[PDB]
Amino acid sequence: KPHRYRPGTVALREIRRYQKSTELLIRKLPFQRLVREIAQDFKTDLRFQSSAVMALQEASEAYLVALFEDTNLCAIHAKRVTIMPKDIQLARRIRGERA
Amino acid sequence: QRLVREIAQDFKTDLRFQSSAVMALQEASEAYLVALFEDTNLCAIHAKRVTIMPKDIQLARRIRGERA
Amino acid sequence: AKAKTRSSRAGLQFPVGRVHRLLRKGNYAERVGAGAPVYLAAVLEYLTAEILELAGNAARDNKKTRIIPRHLQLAVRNDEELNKLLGRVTIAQGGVLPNIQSVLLPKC
Amino acid sequence: AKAKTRSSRAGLQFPVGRVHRLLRKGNYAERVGAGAPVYLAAVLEYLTAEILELAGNAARDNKKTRIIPRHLQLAVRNDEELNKLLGRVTIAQGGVLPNIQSVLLPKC
Amino acid sequence: KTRKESYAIYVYKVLKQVHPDTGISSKAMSIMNSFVNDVFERIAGEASRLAHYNKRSTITSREIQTAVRLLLPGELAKHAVSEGTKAVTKYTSAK
Amino acid sequence: RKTRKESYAIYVYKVLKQVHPDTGISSKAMSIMNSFVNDVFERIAGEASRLAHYNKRSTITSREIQTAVRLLLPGELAKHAVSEGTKAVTKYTSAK
Amino acid sequence: KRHRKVLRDNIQGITKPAIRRLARRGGVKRISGLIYEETRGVLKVFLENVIRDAVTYTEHAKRKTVTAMDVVYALKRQGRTLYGFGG
Amino acid sequence: KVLRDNIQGITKPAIRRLARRGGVKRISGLIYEETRGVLKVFLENVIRDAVTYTEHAKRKTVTAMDVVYALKRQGRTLYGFGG
């Protein structure tokens, strides 16, 4: 009885929405907890200055987004629609970080 | 040596070329070409093909960022 | 007496006074010629004016009168000539340019 | 009075006396702590020693007594760690590493 | 206290020279304050090296101009160079 | 007979003996070392310079490079390299 | 209190929809379920690289707190400069 | 019969050789063209800078060190020819 959108019909909408928008997407609290967790190994009981943490968030998403858009192309180059990890390895390979 | 003299003539006129400076361009271009070649295979094999076509060499130069 | 601004002396908005200070403190060289800071100040004015106009234009084109970084990103990425200078850096809260690959489009 | 070289005084071989002058004219700073160059020269000797050790083993395989760049390119590329130091350097007449993609090989 | 320097006012001043009406947010202001810095050493970088490269011990506008062609691509070179050439002769006119 | 050149040919040659007392060294390869080791020397030196600028210290001392070398060298080499300098400093300091 | 810290499972703080939203901004239309694990490692792999040198700046400065001014510095060395926090 | 653009002086087999050194097995015919253009593009940048240092030094002769300096700018250092 209720209407259903076709597969992918919804998905493209968020595409349009999110590229228009310019705010962060990761949950704020866990990200600050995670960076504390990893940084614990290099040095004990360091204090993260409050403004510094979101900078890591901003760069990370920017760095992350660049990955997927690049991995997107090769999937099309592979005549596919869905990405699987082998693409990211290739993309990381070509730029020269994984290798 | 003819090719470099021809292109250089556009940027400026009457450039005598030091002999030692010459072979550098080949080696630099060679490795650049060689490096630009190998990764193209990975792009090619990724699509399960064996032969490379120019649409790949264009794709590869994009992922490095140099295409833009 | 009756001192006057070097920027005013060349009719420039940018401060010639402070920039020449940096070069002595920047350890870029051991002496600095007089003409160079004037030239350096000049080009910067061109650059910032170039980018600012596009941002201010586009934000107005979006019916908004206060410049915000989302506007700022749009100008840089839409002009390839500047995209070369700023291809490396990404701007905080920049937001991605609206773009969708053609093959992703609906089948009809 | 009699003079002794600083390189001996550190038990080192590289020219601490020379390299110290380089930073003085290198304009990286206006004052250099005298302890810094002695540290610096030590680092290089460790780095240089690391590579020809690898190079020397390669020369053994090809049995030539004279060391050659073909060795050098071969040596510094097999070590994944040293590879990262020079990820964007190309050696004159180095030649690529011997490598073939498995798919290119015959099925059997 | 805690006096800190920037280029906010100058960014504002030229903004009016092209657009006397439109406003700007403080966040985007910092970006120019950041960006105006970012270029400064980059051009100062190549400028510095060339001096030693010709073994020249002083930095001058001639040194700068070639560095302009190196860093900035496309038409901004001849554009800004024209500006720089125009700017210096104006100052030398009122030296 | 003028304009004497400056290089590291003597120095690299000597250390070659300590590792491979037999191996000979080609002339054209010796340029690469005379180039390579120069490449590193500026890469570190500029890197060290900015740290002093960041912290406004008007000097560069063994501390800066020690951190600096901890940056450029990926992972393993640093500890030996750091160890290499530390011992070298100690011998120099002892017979300063 | 004045001891201990949250040091477990925080890699799972990046919940599945969070990446799903992030990828939407990249324009990918359809994603298989396998890719979630790789990026977490990939994200981490990139991450400590940023922190490790960032930590190094602080200890040379002999601080205990991590300033944003240091974060951008390392990001410059890695290559990805950031506008909007300092300079 | 050599009076033409010297880009075609880059013979097709020479390309075929380089693909081998990169490990390329099979090459389509259409590769030979963009490779010319792509290589052509590469020279344009390097010489422009290479010219620049020379004329800044007022020198009419392009010397070897000028090459490596420009190559260093593009993030591709060249060991073996000075510096």
Inter-chain touch D90–H79, beta carbons under 8 Å:
yes
Selection from E47, E12, E3 nearest residue E32 by Cα: E12
Distance in Å, alpha carbon of C81 to nearest chain B alpha carbon: 11
Nearest to F73 by CA among F42, F51, F40: F40
Q: What is d(CA F54, CA E1) in angstroms, rounded to the nearest whole number?
A: 21
- F31/F11 Cα distance (integer angstroms): 13
Residue E7 to residues C72, E15, F76, F77, G87, Cα–Cα distance (Å): 18, 13, 43, 43, 11
Residues of chain A numbered 38-97 and touching chain G (CB < 8 Å)? 38-40, 42-43, 45-49, 51-52, 55-56, 58-65, 67-69, 71-72, 81-85, 88, 92
Q: What domains sit in chain A, N to C, each tagged with a CATH number?
A: 3-99 (1.10.20.10)
Query: Most H CBs within 10 Å: which of E49, E54, E60, E72, as the mutation test of the H interface?
Result: E54
CA torsion, ordered D56, D61, D64, D69, to nearest 10 deg? -60
**Residue of G56, F79, F6, F29 lying closest to D46 (CA atoms):** F79
Cα-to-chain-centroid distance, residue D73: 12
CA separation for the pair A8, A2 (Å, rounded): 18
Answer whether C69 sits within 8 Å of G84, measured CB to CB.
yes
Nearest to C39 among E51, E57, E87 (CB): E87
8 Å CB contact of B60 and A94: yes
Per DSSP, what are the bridge partners of residue H79? D91
- Nearest to H55, CA basis, from C2, B12, C29: B12
Residue C88 near residue G80 (C-beta atoms within 8 A): yes
What token pair was written down for A13?
A: 């909408």
Q: Work out the minimum CA distance from C32 to partner chain D, whole angstroms.
A: 14
Q: Which residues of H touch D93 (CB under 8 A)?
A: 80
Residue E43 belongs to what domain range? 1-93
In one letter, which amino acid is H13?
P
CB F39, CB H79: distance < 8 Å: yes
Rounded-to-integer distance, Cα D65 and Cα E90, Å = 67
**Chain G interface includes F33 (CB < 8 A):** no
Give, in degrees to the nearest 5, the angle at Cα C4 between C3 and C7. Answer: 150
Contact in structure between F82 and D55 (CB atoms under 8 Å): no
Give the integer Cα–Cα distance in Å for H64 and B17: 9
Q: Are E19 and C23 in contact (CB under 8 A)?
A: no
User: What single letter denotes the amino acid at residue B60?
Assistant: A
Q: Phi and psi (nearest 5°) for C33?
A: -70, 150
Please name the residue that has the structure tokens 């900078």. A55
Residue pair E83/C42 in contact by the 8 Å Cβ criterion: yes
H52: nearest CB among E54, E62, E69:
E69
Minimal CA–CA distance to H51: which of B4, C28, E72? B4
Q: Which residues contact B59 (CB under 8 A, 6 or more apart)?
A: A73, A74, A77, B43
Rounded to an integer, what distance in angstroms lies between the CA atom of residue F49 and that of residue D36? 12
Q: Is A48 helix (H, G, I), strand (E, B) or coil?
A: strand
Nearest-CA neighbor of D62 among G9, C40, F26, E48? Answer: F26
- In chain H, the largest separation of any two C-alpha atoms, in whole Å, equals 48
3-state secondary structure of E14: helix
Nearest to D29 by CA among C28, F49, F68, F47: F49
Q: Which residue in the set A12, A21, A81 is minimally distant from C95, CB to CB?
A: A21
What the block records as the tokens of D107 is 């099925």
Distance CA E87, CA F56 (A): 34
Q: What is the DSSP letter of A36?
A: H
Residue of B nearest to A66 (CA): B63
**Residue (of A18, A24, A5) closest to A62 by Cα position:** A24
Residues 6+ apart with CB under 8 A from G6: A33, A36, A37
Q: With the C-alpha atoms ordered G59, G64, G66, G70, is the resulting torsion angle positive or negative?
A: negative
> What backbone phi and psi angles, to 5 degrees, belong to D32?
-115, 125
Considering only CA atoms, which of F29, H24, B31, A93 is closest in space to residue D96?
Answer: B31
User: Which experimental method was this entry solved with?
Assistant: cryo-EM
Q: Rounded to an integer, what distance in angstroms lies between the CA atom of residue H9 and that of residue H1?
A: 11
Q: Tell me which H or E stretch contains D42.
A: helix D35-62
User: What amino acid is encoded at H47 in this protein?
Assistant: I
The CATH number assigned to the domain holding E54 equals 1.10.20.10
A76 C-beta neighbours (distance < 10 Å), count: 15
DSSP chain H: ---S-GGGGS-HHHHHHHHHHTT--EE-TTHHHHHHHHHHHHHHHHHHHHHHHHHHTT-SEE-HHHHHHHHHHTT-EEETS--
How many domains is chain F partitioned into structurally?
A: 1
Report the C-alpha gap between C19 and C38 in whole angstroms: 9
Count CB atoms within 10 A of the CB of residue H34: 17
Q: Which amino acid is at G27?
A: G
Report the b/e string of D9-44 with b at 16+ CB within 10 A.
ebebbbbbeebbebbeebbbbeebbebbbbbbbbbb
Experimental resolution (Å):
4.0
CA–CA dist B41, B50 (Å, integer): 8
Amino acid occupying residue C1? A
